[PDB]
Amino acid sequence: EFRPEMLQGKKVIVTGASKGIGREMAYHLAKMGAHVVVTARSKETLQKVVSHCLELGAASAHYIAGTMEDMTFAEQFVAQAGKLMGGLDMLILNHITNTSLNLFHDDIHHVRKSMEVNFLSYVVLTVAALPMLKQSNGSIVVVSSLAGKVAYPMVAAYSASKFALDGFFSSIRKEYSVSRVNVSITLCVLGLIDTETAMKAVSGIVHMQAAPKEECALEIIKGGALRQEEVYYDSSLWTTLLI
């Protein structure tokens, strides 16, 4: 049974946190009394999230801006975050490269960049974070998609990258299990969440009610805190994916 005090004084990194689900997550952590280090590319907007986080009562809150295309930024970012907080209890990998509904023809560039940002950078961040997570018996949260479990048209490169996440992280979870590494891995399968990005994307299709990003963010946090292997949001997916 989750309680907010579980996050109190915890040292959390949230990526892709200038907007959408990431920013809701940071705000939730702040309200709970965690320390937070947020990142995205956009300085001014990260500062907005930081000051609001402080207002909500974050134990502490800092941003570091950069792109997750740059693997050197990824490594460095982690080193520098753990330093600001003096440690690391939870790594929330949430960011994603810009993607719209397109049929696949010849855009290998988009395919490689999707894999780099949505997947490769998650591996680099994990490798960098692992020493701190080991010492704190901490937690990794990887944010994926129903289209990382079931394939959909018009998002081939995206699905490839989200599938890759399932492939990699579930595998290292079995490895951490056999190697007695006390670091949890939570994979989040999300449906349609009402972020501006996702709603812009789906204006042209028939879909069910998008789920609120505030609640989505909360259920992610809860799942990671409780060290659940997989989180389904909205909850009615849980029945889909297992039937």
Ligand X SMILES: NC(=O)c1ccc[n+]([C@@H]2O[C@H](COP(=O)([O-])OP(=O)(O)OC[C@H]3O[C@@H](n4cnc5c(N)ncnc54)[C@H](OP(=O)(O)O)[C@@H]3O)[C@@H](O)[C@H]2O)c1
Ligand Y SMILES: CC1(C)[C@@H](OC(=O)CCC(=O)O)CC[C@]2(C)[C@H]3C(=O)C=C4[C@@H]5C[C@@](C)(C(=O)O)CC[C@]5(C)CC[C@@]4(C)[C@]3(C)CC[C@@H]12
Measured from the CB of residue 223, what is the shortest distance to Cl ion in angstroms?
20
d(CA 165, CA 189): 11
Closest CA to 25 of 17, 33, 51, 147: 17
108 is in an annotated binding site: no
User: Under rule CB under 8 A, which residues in 90-149 are in contact with its own copies?
Assistant: 103-106, 108, 111-112, 115, 119-120, 123-124, 127, 147-148
**Cβ neighbours, 10 Å, residue 223:** 22
CA angle 115, 81, 94 (to 5 degrees): 35
Minimum Å gap between C-beta 182 and ligand X is 25
Q: Which does 111 bind (CB under 5 to 8 A by kind): its own copies, ligand Y, ligand X, none?
A: its own copies
**Active site (annotated) includes residue 158:** yes
User: What is the nearest approach in angstroms of ligand X to the Cβ of residue 119?
Assistant: 11
Q: Which of 26, 156, 216, 225 touches its own copies (CB under 8 A)?
A: 156
- Is-cis flag, bond preceding 234, omega within 30? yes
By beta-carbon proximity to its own copies, the closer residue of 103 and 208 is 103
Given the structure tokens 């901490």, which residue do they identify?
Answer: 138
**Spatial separation of the C-alpha atoms in residues 165 and 216, rounded to whole Å:** 19
Site residues for ligand X, 8-47, by CB under 6 A, read 16-22, 40-42, 45
Q: How far apart are the first and last CA of the chain?
A: 26
52 lies in the binding site for ligand X (CB under 6 A): no
The answer to the question of whether 1 is labelled as a binding residue is no
Binding of its own copies at residue 153 (CB under 8 A)?
yes
Among 136, 170, 197, 228, binds ligand Y (CB under 6 A): 197
Return the residues of window 69-108 that contact ligand Y according to CB under 6 A: 96, 99, 101
**Cα 107 from Cα 124, distance rounded (Å):** 25
Taking phi over 0 as left and psi of -120 to 50 as alpha, with beta for the rest, 227 belongs to left
Nearest CA among 110, 109, 120, 37 for reference residue 79: 37
Q: Annotated binding site for NADP(+), which residues? A: 16-42, 67-68, 94-96, 158-162, 193-197
- Active-site residues, by number, are 158
- Give the residues lining the site for ligand Y (CB under 6 A): 96, 99, 101, 145-147, 152, 155, 158, 191-192, 195, 197-198, 201-202, 207-208
